Amino acid sequence: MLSRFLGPRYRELARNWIPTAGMWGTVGAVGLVWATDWRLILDWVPYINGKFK
Amino acid sequence: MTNMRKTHPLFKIINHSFIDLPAPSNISSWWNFGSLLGVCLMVQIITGLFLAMHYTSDTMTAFSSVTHICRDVNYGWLIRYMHANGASMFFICLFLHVGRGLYYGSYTFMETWNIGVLLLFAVMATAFMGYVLPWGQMSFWGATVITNLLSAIPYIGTTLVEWIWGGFSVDKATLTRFFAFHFILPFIIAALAIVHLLFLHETGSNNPTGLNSDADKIPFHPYYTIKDILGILIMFLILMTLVLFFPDMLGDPDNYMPANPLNTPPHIKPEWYFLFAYAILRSIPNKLGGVLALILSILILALMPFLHTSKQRSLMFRPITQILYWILVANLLILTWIGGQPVEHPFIIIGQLASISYFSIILILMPISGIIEDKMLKLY
Amino acid sequence: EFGNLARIRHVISYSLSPFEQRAFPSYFSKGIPNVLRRTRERILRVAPPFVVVYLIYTWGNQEFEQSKRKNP
Amino acid sequence: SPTIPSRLYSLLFRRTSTFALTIAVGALFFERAFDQGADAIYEHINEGKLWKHIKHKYEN
Amino acid sequence: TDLTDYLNRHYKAPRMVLAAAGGVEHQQLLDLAQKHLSSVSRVYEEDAVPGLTPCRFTGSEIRHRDDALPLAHVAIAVEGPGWANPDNVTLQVANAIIGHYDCTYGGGVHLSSPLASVAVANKLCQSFQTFNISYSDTGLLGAHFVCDAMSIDDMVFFLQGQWMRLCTSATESEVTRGKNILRNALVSHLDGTTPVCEDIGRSLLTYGRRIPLAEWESRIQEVDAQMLRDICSKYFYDQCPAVAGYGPIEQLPDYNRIRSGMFWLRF
Amino acid sequence: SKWLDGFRKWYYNAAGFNKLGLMRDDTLHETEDVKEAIRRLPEDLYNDRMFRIKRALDLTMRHQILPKDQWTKYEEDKFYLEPYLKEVIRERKEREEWAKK
Numbered sequence: 010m011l012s013r014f015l016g017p018r019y020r021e022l023a024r025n026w027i028p029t030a031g032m033w034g035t036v037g038a039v040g041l042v043w044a045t046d047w048r049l050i051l052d053w054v055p056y057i058n059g060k061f062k
Numbered sequence: 063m064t065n066m067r068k069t070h071p072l073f074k075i076i077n078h079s080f081i082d083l084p085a086p087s088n089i090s091s092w093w094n095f096g097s098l099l100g101v102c103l104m105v106q107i108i109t110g111l112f113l114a115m116h117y118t119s120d121t122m123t124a125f126s127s128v129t130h131i132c133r134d135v136n137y138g139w140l141i142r143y144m145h146a147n148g149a150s151m152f153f154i155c156l157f158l159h160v161g162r163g164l165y166y167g168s169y170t171f172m173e174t175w176n177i178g179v180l181l182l183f184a185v186m187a188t189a190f191m192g193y194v195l196p197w198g199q200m201s202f203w204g205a206t207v208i209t210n211l212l213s214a215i216p217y218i219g220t221t222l223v224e225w226i227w228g229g230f231s232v233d234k235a236t237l238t239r240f241f242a243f244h245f246i247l248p249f250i251i252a253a254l255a256i257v258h259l260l261f262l263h264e265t266g267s268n269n270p271t272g273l274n275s276d277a278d279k280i281p282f283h284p285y286y287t288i289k290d291i292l293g294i295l296i297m298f299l300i301l302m303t304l305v306l307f308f309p310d311m312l313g314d315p316d317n318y319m320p321a322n323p324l325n326t327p328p329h330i331k332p333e334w335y336f337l338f339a340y341a342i343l344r345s346i347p348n349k350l351g352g353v354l355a356l357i358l359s360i361l362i363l364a365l366m367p368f369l370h371t372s373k374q375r376s377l378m379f380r381p382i383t384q385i386l387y388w389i390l391v392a393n394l395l396i397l398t399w400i401g402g403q404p405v406e407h408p409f410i411i412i413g414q415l416a417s418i419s420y421f422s423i424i425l426i427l428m429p430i431s432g433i434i435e436d437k438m439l440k441l442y
Numbered sequence: 443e444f445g446n447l448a449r450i451r452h453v454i455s456y457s458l459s460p461f462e463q464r465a466f467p468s469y470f471s472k473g474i475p476n477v478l479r480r481t482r483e484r485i486l487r488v489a490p491p492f493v494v495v496y497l498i499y500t501w502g503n504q505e506f507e508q509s510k511r512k513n514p
Numbered sequence: 515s516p517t518i519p520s521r522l523y524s525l526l527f528r529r530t531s532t533f534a535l536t537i538a539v540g541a542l543f544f545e546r547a548f549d550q551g552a553d554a555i556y557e558h559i560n561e562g563k564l565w566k567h568i569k570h571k572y573e574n
Numbered sequence: 575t576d577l578t579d580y581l582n583r584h585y586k587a588p589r590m591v592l593a594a595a596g597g598v599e600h601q602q603l604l605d606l607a608q609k610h611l612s613s614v615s616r617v618y619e620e621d622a623v624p625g626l627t628p629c630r631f632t633g634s635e636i637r638h639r640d641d642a643l644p645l646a647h648v649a650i651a652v653e654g655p656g657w658a659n660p661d662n663v664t665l666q667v668a669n670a671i672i673g674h675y676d677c678t679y680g681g682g683v684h685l686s687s688p689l690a691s692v693a694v695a696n697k698l699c700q701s702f703q704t705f706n707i708s709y710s711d712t713g714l715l716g717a718h719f720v721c722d723a724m725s726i727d728d729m730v731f732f733l734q735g736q737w738m739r740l741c742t743s744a745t746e747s748e749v750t751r752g753k754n755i756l757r758n759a760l761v762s763h764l765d766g767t768t769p770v771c772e773d774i775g776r777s778l779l780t781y782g783r784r785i786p787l788a789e790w791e792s793r794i795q796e797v798d799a800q801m802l803r804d805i806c807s808k809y810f811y812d813q814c815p816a817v818a819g820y821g822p823i824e825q826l827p828d829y830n831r832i833r834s835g836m837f838w839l840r841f
Numbered sequence: 842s843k844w845l846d847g848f849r850k851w852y853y854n855a856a857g858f859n860k861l862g863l864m865r866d867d868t869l870h871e872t873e874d875v876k877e878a879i880r881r882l883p884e885d886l887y888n889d890r891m892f893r894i895k896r897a898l899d900l901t902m903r904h905q906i907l908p909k910d911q912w913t914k915y916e917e918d919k920f921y922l923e924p925y926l927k928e929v930i931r932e933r934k935e936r937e938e939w940a941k942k
């Protein structure tokens with residue numbers, strides 16, 4: 010990111026890739042919460058919290 | 063730009079091996095089995111690693127450490143019985159893989175075949191020492207029996223057996239060195255399997271017809287990838303219904319007692335993947351001759367490339383040799399049944415006839431049948 | 443090494459998309475006769491060894507249970 | 515008004531990221547519901563034999 | 575007898591356009607058409623309606639292996655929207671982004687199309703060209719390349735990537751370049767009396783009217799990058815294509831790899 | 842006599858490659874001698890052999906066989922690789938007996 014990414018085409022490419030990156034970060038967040046079985050997120054759910062997990 | 067799959071120096075190997083490898087379109091489900099073997103191998107390693115995390119190789123604290131794994135470690139019973147039943151299923155896949163190689167004429171790949179025979183010897187040694195490892199009654203007495211028949215060798219057998227033992231009997235030196243060898247051998251098997259796949263990929267794989275399959279070839283992905291996932295899941299089904307419903311139908315009850323050199327069991331036998339070898343051993347009334355016959359049984363399996371006297375590769379169009387092949391398979395089943403029996407009537411004569419027919423079918427009758435169908439099809 | 447494995451002339455292959463065709467097209471109705479066809483081709487080569495060794499197993503078990511009897 | 519697999523594909527399965535998102539969401543829903551159903555079935559097979567069926571005569 | 579039946583069934587006035595281009599006044603042409611083409615037997619003699627049922631597109635592949643041919647031709651195409659769909663105009667811009675290339679092109683590495691630039695940098699293809707063939711409600715939207723055998727799969731990969739780029743990462747610069755290319759090609763194609771007459775006849779037969787050139791300019795002008803990637807995701811993304819191959823087409827993959835090339839796991 | 846021919850025909854039906862449309866000479870496992878015999882073949886017989894092998898592989902993939910009218914009969918089973926193979930074995934034996942002296 011020295012000088013060649015300082016351009017409008019690259020900014021509009023990054024703006025195009027914001028929702029895909031955000032959806033993949035959401036996928037990683039939900040997968041991390043489900044896999045590590047975090048209590049601090051799964052206590053505010055309607056259905057999963059009955060097992061306390 | 064470029065293609066990262068084919069131009070990266072690391073991804074080129076995976077692309078050449080498992081992604082864009084040309085494979086025959088008509089290979090059956092038996093072609094899954096060897097891949098399953100590799101999966102089973104790493105499964106064993108994974109379970110073994112966790113069984114190495116709570117086991118102590120010492121005769122005072124081996125059986126107690128195994129019971130500590132079964133009772134106190136969280137799901138340690140699951141990993142231990144997965145290790146044992148996956149060893150049994152590893153040999154199931156081994157016998158079906160070798161039987162595929164014998165039936166479909168895959169032994170014409172001579173370097174791959176001999177490398178595979180080396181892998182077979184290594185996994186049999188690994189399983190033998192691993193069965194010695196939990197230090198039950200049958201572990202100690204099976205190790206004693208195998209080392210005594212190794213001591214039957216003239217003039218070097220006694221020195222070799224007291225050097226394998228590390229002493230005058232089976233003791234904690236033997237247990238520790240068997241733990242070390244049982245640990246280290248599967249990585250040698252993994253490197254040897256890499257060489258096995260290398261020789262196969264530079265020679266190509268074989269179809270069940272035995273014909274040249276270059277006319278109809280498909281990539282490995284996504285056909286045989288998903289076919290091997292289905293085979294892996296079926297292998298997991300059989301392994302999980304063996305570990306979760308019948309944990310001891312293949313195991314030995316006398317292994318659940320602590321090892322006692324003073325008390326000998328009324329019946330001493332190895333596990334079921336050694337039983338046909340033991341029955342071949344028990345038939346010949348000469349211990350040097352029995353060990354000679356065992357090693358030459360596995361070596362005539364290795365020598366099977368040099369007995370091919372037919373113009374057709376596979377047994378798909380050879381029904382007489384098909385009949386002889388199924389006689390051989392049923393004879394192997396008979397030897398497996400006899401190996402778990404004592405030396406009583408009528409098991410001696412049945413075992414002797416079984417070993418004689420086994421060696422005669424492998425050595426004599428199969429090239430004779432090949433010549434007979436060669437004449438009978440006007441080939442020569 | 444696709445592209446140089448063999449040399450084939452004048453062969454036309456037609457294939458469908460997996461999304462335009464059924465996964466199990468007439469599964470049982472054309473699966474059962476093919477299974478019995480393969481069975482009819484293979485049982486006369488496969489089964490009689492297993493029948494013979496089942497007979498040997500039963501005879502050996504019978505002789506072992508008879509050989510431990512009292513009389514004489 | 516299309517079929518429910520049509521709108522299910524067009525809203526859930528067309529993009530790979532939301533495909534994986536619904537795989538994860540259905541995975542956590544499925545693990546909760548499947549553990550509920552499996553413990554219900556295993557409880558229904560074994561009346562009067564488990565410890566949780568008899569921990570009132572002794573717990574006090 | 576069958577030719578006479580075909581003439582009696584198909585050569586009728588409501589399916590006939592007399593087009594003239596050049597130094598032709600409409601009054602003289604109308605007077606000559608009224609004098610000569612007044613009687614055409616436009617009655618349905620058999621009293622059976624000839625219709626035009628829609629055609630079913632089939633995702634499939636045909637491959638004609640013949641290894642004695644020196645070069646391999648491969649065409650991959652998906653279903654087009656039709657004659658009367660406005661989105662065809664947008665698809666034309668999409669083809670103008672992909673463009674075409676032949677081995678006798680004087681440009682070289684510095685071609686604007688990434689597919690042509692990578693094809694001349696890696697010496698992949700003899701030629702490629704995009705096409706949008708249109709029929710009533712249907713059509714074929716795709717690409718055609720001739721190349722040697724050893725390049726085929728690589729070329730397919732690059733072509734698929736370009737399609738997915740237009741479904742995902744179409745920026746305004748190449749959209750403007752495709753708009754200018756479509757403007758120049760669609761105006762300079764109508765140079766001469768013959769292409770003008772062909773445009774008049776085909777436009778009156780297909781659209782029911784002759785579309786003015788300023789209407790084409792106004793339809794090109796509204797195309798930006800967002801609707802171009804919307805239309806490309808509608809027609810190219812996650813679709814089942816049709817593949818036709820002829821020549822040494824062994825390295826041309828199965829239908830499953832080409833079908834897997836129509837979507838990105840990263841997107 | 843004719844009994845041996847009928848029993849050979851029964852074994853030919855029992856072998857099973859004729860149900861795949863194959864011939865006898867297609868079922869040869871290709872060694873170097875068979876490879877040179879295929880290399881010496883005319884183009885039409887080579888193309889017929891390649892299509893027959895490809896069709897046999899396609900049928901073996903689907904675990905199916907041809908219909909009984911399309912089975913290769915014992916009468917018209919032309920032995921096309923035998924003279925090329927015989928000359929290849931003869932030339933190899935000539936090279937062998939030269940190298941043994």
Ligand SMILES: CCCCCCCCCCCCCCCCCC(=O)OC[C@H](COP(=O)(O)OCCN)OC(=O)CCCCCCCCCCCCCCCCC
Pocket residue numbers: 381382385389392393396412415416419481482483484485486487490491494495498852855
């Ligand atoms: C007729 C059907 C009646 C019932 C109708 C219902 C349908 C059933 C299926 C019908 C099939 C029709 C025919 C199509 C199949 C193909 C032909 C076939 O299989 O024929 C039967 C076969 C004939 O033999 P074939 O291999 O064809 O050729 C030999 C050369 N004459 O014959 C055989 O393969 C017979 C093999 C017999 C083997 C006997 C072995 C005895 C000895 C075993 C010892 C093993 C243990 C040794 C232990 C030693 C130590 C104790």
Ligand code: HEM
Pocket residue numbers: 103106107108109110111113114117128142145146148149150152153185188189192193194195196244245246247248249
């Ligand atoms: C490098 C990988 C491996 C390690 C670290 C390993 C380690 C161990 C350990 C610690 C034990 C004793 C635990 C117990 O059985 O209670 C054991 C047992 C055993 N291992 Fe392995 N092992 C490995 C690979 C294998 C392989 C590849 C096989 C053969 C398929 C095998 C077969 C066995 C058998 C049969 C037993 C005896 C199980 C029983 O008690 O009945 N092991 N292994």
Ligand code: HEM
Pocket residue numbers: 092093094095096097099100103159160163168169171174175178179181182185255258259262266267268269
């Ligand atoms: C120790 C475990 C073994 C592993 C992990 C293993 C692994 C594999 C793999 C992955 C393949 C390719 C897939 C296939 O076609 O089946 C294969 C094929 C083969 N293996 Fe093994 N193998 C093992 C044991 C053996 C043994 C003991 C032999 C010798 C009898 C052997 C001989 C062969 C042959 C001849 C083939 C080629 C068969 C063919 O592709 O047509 N393998 N093996």
